[PDB]
Design a protein around this ligand. Structure first.
Ligand code: NAG
Ligand code: NAG
Length: 310
């Protein structure tokens, strides 16, 4: 045939372990498993290289450990399974060929496991919208080929490890809606990511070293933190910045007039300690007043005109 018998028996184990959910109805010992839904075989090796279990509210239990028994997996997705619980099983460490691991929108908990650096082909690592706990493993920073890391919407505490600025190739990082504390590491000055989303944490201090004219940054969201620095020290911006959200921080100083050279699509500095005139140009008078409310003394279009004598 085509379907490898060992890949076949592992899939039949996983089906059994999940209590024959409906989404595995295609998994019949009649038909070649390469034919089945949710899975993909390689063209040459004919091994299972893909398993996508998604969007099934009734599916109850843990990640079956027999996922470790599909040794040629390149993509393993468990997404939008609210009744999936327990911890990420240690067995995923034997999946040396994964490029895409997405375990997200589930009730997976415990610590972020420590074996991910060993998964050297990883390009996408998405553990987002779970109940993961404790600190970020700094050694994740050693993966050589990551494009994106999603740890957003868990229950992670502690600081951003210094070495998280040193990912080879500067992948996008999403840490938002956790309980992270301390400063953004200055190692991020040397990183060139396209997107960063650290919003809804308890981060403090400065991020001025994230901006600057040779960076390829397009999207920055640090809204809902306690950032406390003088925005006047950012006098040049990454030219392709189109999304900048800093609402709900303790940022002070004033808006550089260099902001008017950006094609900003999204812009929000509401609920800060900013002062002085909103500069004229670019898209700045195109944002409605809600991008600028709850500041100390910003004035001008679209806020009311500057009134020094009142
Ligand atoms: C903030 O930084 C700039 C230059 O880096 C300085 O000129 C300015 O007065 C400082 N602002 C405040 C409010 O301390
Ligand atoms: C800015 O943020 C506030 C708070 O999240 C929100 O209510 C408001 O609509 C936002 N405005 C813009 C223009 O993004």
């Amino acid at each position: 045939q085509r379907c490898n018998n060992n890949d076949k028996q592992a899939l039949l184990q996983i089906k059994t372990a999940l209590k024959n959910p409906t989404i595995t109805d295609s998994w019949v010992s009649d038909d070649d498993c390469c034919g089945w839904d949710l899975v993909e075989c390689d063209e040459t090796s004919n091994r299972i290289i893909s398993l996508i279990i998604q969007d099934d509210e009734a599916l109850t239990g843990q990640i079956p450990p027999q996922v470790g028994d599909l040794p040629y997996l390149q993509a393993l997705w468990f997404r939008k399974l609210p009744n999936l619980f327990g911890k990420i099983p240690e067995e995923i460490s034997a999946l040396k060929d994964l490029k895409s691991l997405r375990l997200s929108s589930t009730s997976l908990s415990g610590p972020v496991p420590l074996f991910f650096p060993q998964l050297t082909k990883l390009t996408c690592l998405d553990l987002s919208f779970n109940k993961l706990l404790g600190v970020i493993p700094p050694q994740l920073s050693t993966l050589p080929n990551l494009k994106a890391l999603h740890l957003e919407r868990n229950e992670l505490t502690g600081e951003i490890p210094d070495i998280f600025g040193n990912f080879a190739g500067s992948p996008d990082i999403y840490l938002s809606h956790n309980q992270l504390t301390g400063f953004v590491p200055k190692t991020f000055a040397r990183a060139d990511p396209i997107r960063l989303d650290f919003s809804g944490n308890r981060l403090e201090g400065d991020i001025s070293f994230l901006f600057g004219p040779k960076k390829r940054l397009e999207m920055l969201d640090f809204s809902g933190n306690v950032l406390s620095f003088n925005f006047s020290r950012v006098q040049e911006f990454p030219p392709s910045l189109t999304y900048l959200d800093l609402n709900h921080n303790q940022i002070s100083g004033s808006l550089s007039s260099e902001l008017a050279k950006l094609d900003l699509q999204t812009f929000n500095v509401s609920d800060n300690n900013l002062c002085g005139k909103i500069p004229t140009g670019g898209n700045l008078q195109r944002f409605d007043r809600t991008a600028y409310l709850h500041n100390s003394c910003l004035c001008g279009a679209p806020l009311p005109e500057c009134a020094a004598a009142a």
